[PDB]
Amino acid sequence: MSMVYMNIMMAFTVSLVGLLMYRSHLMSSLLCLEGMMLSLFVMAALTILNSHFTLASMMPIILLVFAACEAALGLSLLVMVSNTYGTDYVQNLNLLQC
Amino acid sequence: MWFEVLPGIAVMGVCLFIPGMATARIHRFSNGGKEKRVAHYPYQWYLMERDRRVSGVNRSYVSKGLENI
Amino acid sequence: PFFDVQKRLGVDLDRWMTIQSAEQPHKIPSRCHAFEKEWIECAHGIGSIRAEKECKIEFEDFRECLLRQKTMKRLHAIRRQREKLIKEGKYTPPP
Amino acid sequence: SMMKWNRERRRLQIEDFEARIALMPLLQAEKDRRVLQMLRENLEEEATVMKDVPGWKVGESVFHTTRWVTPMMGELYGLRASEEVLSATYGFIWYT
Amino acid sequence: MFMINILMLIIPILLAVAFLTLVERKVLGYMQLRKGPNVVGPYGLLQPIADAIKLFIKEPLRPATSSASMFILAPIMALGLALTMWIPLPMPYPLINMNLGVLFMLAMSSLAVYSILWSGWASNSKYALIGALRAVAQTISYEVTLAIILLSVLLMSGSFTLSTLITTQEQMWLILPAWPLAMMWFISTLAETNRAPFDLTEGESELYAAGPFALFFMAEYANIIMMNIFTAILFLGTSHNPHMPELYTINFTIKSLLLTMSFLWIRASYPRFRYDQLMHLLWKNFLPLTLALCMWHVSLPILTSGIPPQT
Amino acid sequence: MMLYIVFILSVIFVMGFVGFSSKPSPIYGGLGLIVSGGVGCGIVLNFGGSFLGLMVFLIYLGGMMVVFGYTTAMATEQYPEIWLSNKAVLGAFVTGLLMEFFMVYYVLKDKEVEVVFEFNGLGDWVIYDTGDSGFFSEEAMGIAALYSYGTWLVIVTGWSLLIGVVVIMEITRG
Amino acid sequence: AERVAAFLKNVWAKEPVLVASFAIAGLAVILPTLSPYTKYSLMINRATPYNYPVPLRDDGNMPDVPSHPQDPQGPSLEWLKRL
Amino acid sequence: MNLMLALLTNFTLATLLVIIAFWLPQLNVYSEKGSARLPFSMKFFLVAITFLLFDLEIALLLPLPWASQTANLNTMLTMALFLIILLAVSLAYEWTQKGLEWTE
Amino acid sequence: MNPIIFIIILLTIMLGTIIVMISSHWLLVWIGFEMNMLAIIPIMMKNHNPRATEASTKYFLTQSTASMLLMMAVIINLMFSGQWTVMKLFNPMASMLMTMALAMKLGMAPFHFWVPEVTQGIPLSSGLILLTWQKLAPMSVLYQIFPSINLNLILTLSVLSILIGGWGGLNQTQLRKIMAYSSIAHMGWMTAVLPYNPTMTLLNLIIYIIMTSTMFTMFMANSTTTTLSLSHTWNKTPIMTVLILATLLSMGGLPPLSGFMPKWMIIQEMTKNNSIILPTFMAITALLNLYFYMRLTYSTTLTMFPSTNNMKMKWQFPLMKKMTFLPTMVVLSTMMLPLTPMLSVLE
């Protein structure tokens, strides 16, 4: 494939590994989730623009809109977690262990 | 008196006047004395590129008329 | 679709954007319009098991238009040869 | 006032669009010859460059179909000075 | 030749900002029955120079910041973006002729809130961080109406190109068909630029220094001028004669000057909004009207048969 | 060369991703995403997507990323930790840059590389279209078609946004 | 009729901003259906020729298709010139 | 190329002014003289989140000037009003649920 | 939650699922999943406590990750075929990514860890939705893309799920965790037969939903969430203990009860394809499920556990919970085997 696709897919893989390899902050993991969205938006836009798929030109916008709404829900969960424990550390979310 | 506020306003006005005046005259200087060509759409760019080849000096703003027919 | 409600009601909810050879604003064609049209017409109605074999020619051409893998490989071949000759003085490009 | 002016502007756009339609046949004829000339020129250099490369047919299509296929940028400007390639690829996008 | 053009935009912008400080002080003075600067140079014409030099040779007292990179980033972002806002402005010819120029200005202006946020983080003080967040909330809130008002106007213009606003207003200023939007647009720019009666960053901290303070101030006043240049183009379109572009530049400058002076006029005339009150002015007053006028301006060209051309 | 602008931007794109994906302080991780967003817009711009490019700036960076930074300052980090101070972050950051540099170096030396899958390295311009002379933006035509063709898309998109408002008010009431 | 009139006077006195919003939004929804000019917006949009009008092969039985653009057959924009 | 040069000039100059503003002669020879819940209302979160959702709606209204050029005006006008009305319903919901209040 | 809002949120959970089921476009399928996940979170959060917040967060992270992977599969599919139609995918890497994403959405092993934890942390009514209605949309996509799924991948997921579900349930005293591990085991049967006969996937899904709804409804009727709390039912509602016994035996796949029918039919389809080891291994491994179902029957119906004195006060009040459709569902859950040939309606 084209050379640009090498790096866009690499960016998605890098953010996916970042997402699956948590540290402590929940916000850091939410940023990786947005990173995957941004790489998906670029890969979709490049494919659609280069192929001149005219009606598909709106699809990246719909992706952006829906994923931003997803991120707003994710942020709201983060603040509720932070209100409970005083931080957004994932290690605090282990009650359902038992 | 109030008109002693005008000198500061005049300096401000001349300062805001230069950007627009400079761009207009620079465009004429760089485009053969005409307005800079606007190409927002592929059709306009296509005609501008065709003008560059037709000019014979690789300048889209150098026009050729009936003398080339 | 799992439940083909669209076809039952004759209403087009998302079919309009499924393929690039469908109707587009101002009749703007996709780059691979003719290749997608050919493949779709070859494989229409015969099922995907049959189409995977009987329409392989149209699909390979359509895939070549989509990603141009064979074209880029050919261009890479000619360019690489040209560098060698430039590196050996047996070729001078024209004007 | 805005309605009257916008209707006039729509009439001015139709006149501008119809001038383009009058010229499109001439431009299309020119474009066809330029594309075919460029492809022909690349085919001569290919014959020279790939003369002593085994199993290389010169001008061989990569498609099974014999239909005419529009070339992509790399096919036309494959072997030309970067100044022209950059203008062809990114000139419009970059123009102001 | 193009680099000359860039400099001939940047330098006059910075000089106009400098002397707006003089003009603001003198206009405010005469509305307060006094004079304002009139000693440092004739009619105070050297006052901006003395202030600029003073600020830059002042001790740059920066407390040990929690982030060195974000302390430097905030002023660079603020000033860099402020100058960028000027490059698509047609006066009558833009430096950069963008097909989506209006959209470019909206997108760049939405980034200016990062300088507020980053400067809050770098302050290393929860009190200044809380002040930053209150300012960010005010700024994004009024971005909602600015975008919708702008969209409503463009439904009469037909495109996102800034120079097409000139064509749209060849016969008549857009303020006549759209004075309700011009009213809310104008107030929104005041709140956007944290200008009185929406200057709640200054008032609340009451109730940066030297060059770095000067840079944030320059960016603020560049934005103030640019907002009023935008308003003049959006609603008070000047006619352009292609053979005498300087007549456009004179008339359009006067309108922008007057609009900028009205910012100073308003600052002299009213008390300050409470924070919750300027939030209610947006969410409970401007936004309901802007939404209704947005619906109206979608329908109006269709129902009158006055849809503008795309090109 | 400017003939490799798209490739160069995509190299920076990846470096920004290795930046926040190594997960430093969420303040610096947010900066890495902002830089990646801007670089990503430039990549989309050079393929002819002016509107789509500006939406990333307007909505993704001026909208979502602003709210991310806003929320971070409130409920996560108020003062950044020194960047690359933690060994795990530095190891991850260095590893991603080392991988990226090798891809770039090898694809540039051979004008092609096989990192899992095989890519071409001649430059992205080679795949571009060679025949455009229409009096409009095709991307603009497609997006404008949301209101003629995409009635169903508008309904479900508008509904989801309204529900997002209702939902987030339920979540946060506590 | 009156209890509604007594309702409008109350909201006009208490919430003139909201009354204006709802009034404008109602006109935006209603007036397009009543306007006699709405039909012209459709025609003008269709009269704008964005792409080339590809000619038809003449098979000898198309008397309603002009042979020349200046012939009298085919759609006319005389209605638009007056508008 | 021009836009890149303009952007590079604007931020390069901004950078130069900032650094020189920090490093100027001083004429002195003597020694010079964390991630928790910030005490900030949930109301300010809801403003930012409310702005985001309205901003996403605005993204969908932006194509309207181009959409008005369609021959399918009946569909286009119905969908434009639907989207704006839904935006108004969103505001009405926050308003009547005391989401726009600053007391308490 | 305001009752009108609850209804609208529930209708949006259903609409998201329906959009997935009627869509012919991958983008609309993705939207359906996003809409569905948006509306489900509030009903997980509705009792406002740290356990519910942890459950909703773990759910959000799992589902949002899976939806990004699904979008990636769709886009790879677009690049290699230039179309969006919901059907077989045209790239093996796209097929794997979509299969893994749907496995994460279904909570199949080894992506199962979230199911027991999320189910434990939310109310019974919310857990009922999570383990029944929420399986419909991902299964309806597998139903359509199966011609291109990797056989080894899907059967590995099935085998792991049956093993993990059976073993995981052996160690549970919480009713919500038992149902969760039971769900993981049952998803394994549904997907094991998918490559061979998707109709049996639908049959197993439908019967699974009926039986699962019956159990949750009977747990809600008595407000029981633990094994010991359930063991007091005999002293309050003896009829309920019998209905639980029948439903548990049916869920254990014992003939002549309804739950035997899916296992019976799936074994038949697999053997017709000369798959003998896998069905036999599956059937024996499902005896682990039968074991911890039987344990519950012992402490609920077949013995009488100790009571408390305050239980007498409960004797003076009648059941007031809705128990909607419970009489119908319990009959279907147990007495349908004689109508097995009716499965052809699912063709």
Ligand SMILES: CCCCCCCCCCCCCCCCCC(=O)OC[C@H](COP(=O)(O)OCCN)OC(=O)CCCCCCCCCCCCCCCCC
């Ligand atoms: C038709 C073709 C399909 C064939 C498949 C097989 C169908 C059978 C499955 C049908 C579904 C189960 C329905 C069983 C109805 C149970 C009603 C009953 O038998 O009485 C319950 C009894 C009532 O007690 P009470 O509420 O107090 O009222 C009397 C006052 N003392 O409550 C009690 O007193 C408690 C009794 C103690 C517990 C004893 C349990 C052993 C008896 C089990 C009977 C149910 C069988 C379940 C397993 C299926 C068997 C094949």
Ligand SMILES: CCCCCCCCCCCCO[C@@H]1O[C@H](CO)[C@@H](O[C@H]2O[C@H](CO)[C@@H](O)[C@H](O)[C@H]2O)[C@H](O)[C@H]1O
């Ligand atoms: C929970 C809320 C559920 C609400 C469900 C509402 C369903 C609404 C269905 C909308 C689609 C109706 O049906 C579809 O509509 C559009 C516009 O009307 C039509 O589309 C029309 O506009 C564009 C113009 O090119 C094209 O799609 C097509 O050329 C034309 O026919 C479709 O031909 C028709 O099949």
Ligand SMILES: CCCCCCCCCCCCO[C@@H]1O[C@H](CO)[C@@H](O[C@H]2O[C@H](CO)[C@@H](O)[C@H](O)[C@H]2O)[C@H](O)[C@H]1O
């Ligand atoms: C805009 C271009 C203007 C070009 C002008 C070039 C002039 C260069 C000469 C600079 C003279 C600055 O003069 C000097 O400024 C610094 C500001 O930190 C002052 O302050 C400095 O000295 C005092 C003690 O004296 C220290 O406690 C202080 O920490 C230190 O910053 C000095 O008291 C003042 O003497």
Ligand SMILES: CCCCCCCCCCCCO[C@@H]1O[C@H](CO)[C@@H](O[C@H]2O[C@H](CO)[C@@H](O)[C@H](O)[C@H]2O)[C@H](O)[C@H]1O
């Ligand atoms: C003409 C149609 C034009 C299209 C309009 C576009 C859609 C806009 C939808 C806005 C719906 C708002 O609906 C609004 O709900 C609340 C219900 O609490 C009502 O307001 C009610 O509650 C408030 C408190 O908040 C009370 O003080 C008030 O006395 C009471 O009327 C409003 O009277 C009503 O207007």
Ligand SMILES: CCCCCCCCCCCCO[C@@H]1O[C@H](CO)[C@@H](O[C@H]2O[C@H](CO)[C@@H](O)[C@H](O)[C@H]2O)[C@H](O)[C@H]1O
């Ligand atoms: C919460 C849900 C909110 C949904 C809001 C939807 C409101 C829709 C209101 C406007 C709908 C009709 O708006 C307008 O009506 C007239 C009917 O006279 C239509 O008809 C008019 O235009 C058409 C062009 O297509 C002409 O052929 C016709 O002669 C003319 O009467 C218009 O095409 C339509 O633009």
Ligand SMILES: CCCCCCCCCCCCO[C@@H]1O[C@H](CO)[C@@H](O[C@H]2O[C@H](CO)[C@@H](O)[C@H](O)[C@H]2O)[C@H](O)[C@H]1O
């Ligand atoms: C879990 C990490 C997720 C990261 C995802 C990263 C993006 C993945 C990129 C997938 C795109 C490449 O996908 C891959 O392309 C090549 C050709 O291009 C295909 O083709 C390849 O295998 C088949 C084998 O018959 C042949 O075509 C040929 O031998 C070879 O080129 C592969 O069948 C396909 O799997």
Ligand SMILES: N=C(N)NC(=N)NCCc1ccc(I)c(Cl)c1
């Ligand atoms: N608000 C006012 N107008 N007066 C005022 N305090 N001005 C600030 C003075 C100032 C700041 C930066 C620069 I550069 C310059 Cl030259 C002058």
Ligand SMILES: N=C(N)NC(=N)NCCc1ccc(I)c(Cl)c1
């Ligand atoms: N996919 C499979 N392996 N099985 C399958 N569905 N075979 C199709 C054969 C069949 C069987 C029963 C009926 I009733 C009908 Cl109409 C058709």
